[PDB]
Design a protein around this ligand. Structure first.
Ligand SMILES: [Cl-]
Ligand SMILES: [Cl-]
Lengths: 386, 388
């Protein structure tokens, strides 16, 4: 079982990993002193495999540095490092039509633009956290302006229409971060709408599943893409909802919703043969066609670590402590690089390493440091209440 | 020493029997959609459907195969009728109002996705050309020749980091070869020459013994994640297209040397010395490859390397190509072929264990494998006739 003694040990473990292993792998060496932003596409030993810049990750990194400054320690280099990324986003990462790029060169020239606005949402949370850390009013205004645009995008968009869970999920966490940094009067009412959308359309109690995509009326699309599940993604949404429950004084309705989602997708996603969270599953257990479906990626493990620990501290249910122990031990034993620090991203189904890089177009200083920071902070609060 | 004439005769019979008694019957006639036309090809290991959608490229590839079997193996009416069903489905449902082809449609032909490629059109060219030869349908011949010109058009003028890809000259070369070998077109030979020259000039790097997938417009290597990424099976597919052309051109020594060089370079980079088989992606400077499936063992690179090694052996007589053919043939038939239900699995982990059980989807269908068995059966029949 998870005694207060063991929870105190876990608190110190996550704090030590965050501050002595994870953050120093990236900072300050990744700050680009010549062009601004961050050089983050790094191999296992920290050497660069590319000098390109992933726009989402630039925003995520500035958000992380600002959040550490705000909640851990007011280190000037973290603040300066956050401003570097904010300035790079503003100077180089917007196209002439007002939408953000996805992928740019070291010096800010565009490589690719996507038809999502997830770039904008990471700019919101970056500017919001930076505004609180620095008191920069231009950043606070920018965060609220971009948030209103994302709200428009989300509501005012072949023969098989689908809606995806990713939009309400990302909008929910964006609004949570805005609320918790500088505030915005629109956050709570829109969070309510996005939780309702998740519960109404994507959570299926009869078959104990959380869908990634459904038809506009909520029905399951019985085709290869429509059947494809992402357990780690669903469980990320579950802990966003549990976080909201805590914020609303441990709202039992939201606790029930988040816990169901976790229960459903733990059962579907945990690999009983090798351990770990499988990347994709199929709602009807048909063979999954996306090639990396049985690989073990870092970030589903980060999100399930958060969700199980948060479910445990809220409900006291021993099964969530059991699941936390399983995923925590699996992840730190398989992904963490004891020699050079930080985590590998990509393992085969059997847990062996597929390739050595620690940063690329998708991985950087976000899912892992957020998990270590959130768990350290959560357990600090929990143990101050006991 | 490696391969005697008797052994080559046994191999010819193997590829022939696998093609006609195992591979083709897994798919046909049961996949012909009598109600809506075209083919239901997204099947699990036991042949049951996992989806009733239709991948437009694969509809064209399957109609090409059925017509080719009709023209070169046996004039079975069921194959002709089956080819016609795919041609008709393409014409009735797979073209948008602007003349461009869709990529992915429903069972009843409604559009799901349209891609900016013209690859879909190249598979309509080869399907219509083969079908025209089989049936004498003049409209199919006219369509194949018209669309071939449209593909040439796009190929000449196909974004701060411009890049050129080897797939364009490769797919255009094979399209032109198939047009030549079915109904004929006066443009084929000159354009094949241009596409071979493009491959040699821009993509084959002799100093580092590599064939690139993409390069900058002047041929320089793009030293970023995507630009460094190599696909050994794709390069070796291009190598055998070139060796095929060498034979047509009266065993042109320049083309033989070029195709063999490409094969040699990418066998060395692509063969997995630890677990066996051809790796899907590599990096030109041996940096870690970022695409997630880089170390998986897919069916189709093995089909293309089986062709290339056997073709190179028959042309050059170099025993190393027989050695490599034996290695990849034994590896692929032992790991991918499903002796219980027929046909081949598509997707293995690096270590050769099965990743999932499906035999058709948006990308796999009756194309790379039956083309390999048909090409090898045919090549060996011709070779053994010469050795008598
Ligand atoms: Cl990340
Ligand atoms: Cl195929």
């Amino acid at each position: 079982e998870y005694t207060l003694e063991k929870l105190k040990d876990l608190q110190g473990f996550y704090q030590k990993q965050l501050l002595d292993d994870t953050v120093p792998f990236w900072f300050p060496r990744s700050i680009d002193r010549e062009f601004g932003g961050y050089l983050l596409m790094r191999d296992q030993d920290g050497s660069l495999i590319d000098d390109d810049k992933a726009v989402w990750i630039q925003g995520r990194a500035a958000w992380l540095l600002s959040t550490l400054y705000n909640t851990v320690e007011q280190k000037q280099e973290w603040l300066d490092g956050a401003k570097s990324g904010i300035d790079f986003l503003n100077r180089h990462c917007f196209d002439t039509d007002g939408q953000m790029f996805f992928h740019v060169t070291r010096d800010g020239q565009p490589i690719r633009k996507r038809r999502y606005y997830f770039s904008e949402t990471f700019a919101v949370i970056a500017n919001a956290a930076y505004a609180k850390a620095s008191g920069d009013e231009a950043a606070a205004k920018q965060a609220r302006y971009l948030f209103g645009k994302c709200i428009e995008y989300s509501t005012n968009p072949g023969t098989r229409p689908a809606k995806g869970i990713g939009v309400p999920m990302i909008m929910m966490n964006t609004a949570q971060q805005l609320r918790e940094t500088i505030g915005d009067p629109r956050c709570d009412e829109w969070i309510d709408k996005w939780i309702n959308e998740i519960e109404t359309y994507f959570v299926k109690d009869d078959i104990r599943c959380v869908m990634e995509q459904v038809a506009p009326d909520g029905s399951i699309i019985d085709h290869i893409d429509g059947r494809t599940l992402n357990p780690g993604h669903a469980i990320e949404g579950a802990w966003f909802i549990l976080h909201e429950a805590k914020y609303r004084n441990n709202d039992p309705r939201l606790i029930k919703l988040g816990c169901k989602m976790l229960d459903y997708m733990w059962d579907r996603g945990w690999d009983k043969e090798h351990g770990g969270i499988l990347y994709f599953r199929d709602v009807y257990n048909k063979p999954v066609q996306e090639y990396w479906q049985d690989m073990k990626f870092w970030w589903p493990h980060n999100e399930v670590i958060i969700a199980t620990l948060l479910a445990y501290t809220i409900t006291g249910e021993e099964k969530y402590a059991q699941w936390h122990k399983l995923v925590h031990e699996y992840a730190y034993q398989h992904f963490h690089d004891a020699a050079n620090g930080e985590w590998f991203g990509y393992l085969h189904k059997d847990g062996t390493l597929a390739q050595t890089a620690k940063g690329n177009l998708f991985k950087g200083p976000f899912h892992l440091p957020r998990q270590e920071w959130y768990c350290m902070t959560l357990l600090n609060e929990y143990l101050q209440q006991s």
